[PDB]
């Protein structure tokens, strides 16, 4: 109930304060095993930080433990990707996985099957760059992904569950209010506000698409036995065929 009484400014402050740290990779020619190792070791360390971030997104801890699990299982790769695209914004043509792991397309591919996903991620970063996405907008969009992506697959029809979905949707509306408030503060006309809101939310459909492709790629890499995946990462992956 505290979440639903936050002002736009308090929401931004809360989201900015929740932000996880930027993690590092390992400190010569890459292989498929070594690169997948670095990327999955990084993703695993980030997931621990993501859990603690999610607990700090206003409204999240109001939900049952079952529902928190469901939202994070659905959203985790989208959340990793939007963070990656954000870090990469100011580095045209590169993906900044970590400050000491910046990958370009010019580099010979060392991992099979990932060029399409690579290019989609780059295209997203370029879209954000063209739109001049602001940090305060980014944290709103990341929280929208956490709350939105899994809410449609709460199929439970019990009263408690309906109240839970209601609450998620009330929080989502607050985040929408916050995004529009940021745009109004920036001097956008009412018409420009609604247009930009739509432009940003339509990008989340692309991010969903990339997560779906990335999940299939990670699964293929698991099946190939190229990389030892952490127990947590395997369970986050397993959630997408369970």
């Amino acid at each position: 109930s505290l979440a639903l009484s936050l002002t736009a400014d308090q929401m931004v402050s809360a989201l900015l304060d929740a932000e996880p740290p930027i993690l590092y990779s390992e400190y010569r020619p890459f292989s498929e095993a070594s690169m997948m190792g670095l990327l999955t070791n990084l993703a695993d360390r980030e997931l621990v930080h993501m859990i603690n971030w999610a607990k700090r997104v206003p409204g999240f801890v109001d939900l049952t433990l079952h529902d928190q699990v469901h939202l994070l299982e659905c959203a985790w790769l989208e959340i990793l990707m939007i963070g990656l695209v954000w870090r990469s914004m100011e580095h045209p043509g590169k993906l900044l996985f970590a400050p000491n792991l910046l990958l370009d397309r010019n580099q010979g591919k060392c991992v099979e099957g990932m060029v399409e996903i690579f290019d989609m991620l780059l295209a997203t970063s370029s879209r954000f760059r063209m739109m001049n996405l602001q940090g305060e907008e980014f944290v709103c969009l990341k929280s929208i992904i956490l709350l939105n992506s899994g809410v449609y697959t709460f199929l439970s029809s019990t009263l408690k569950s309906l109240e839970e979905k209601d609450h998620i949707h009330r929080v989502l509306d607050k985040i929408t209010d916050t995004l529009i408030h940021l745009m109004a503060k920036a001097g956008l006309t009412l018409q420009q506000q609604h247009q930009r809101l739509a432009q940003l939310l339509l990008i989340l459909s692309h991010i969903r698409h990339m997560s779906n492709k990335g999940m299939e790629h990670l699964y293929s890499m698991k099946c190939k036995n190229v990389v030892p995946l952490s127990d947590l990462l395997l369970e986050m992956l397993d959630a997408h065929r369970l």
Partner: peptide, 11 residues
């Protein structure tokens, strides 16, 4: 499923 559940509780 269990590891995530444990981490969400964990503080």
């Amino acid at each position: 499923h269990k590891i995530l559940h444990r981490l969400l509780q964990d503080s």
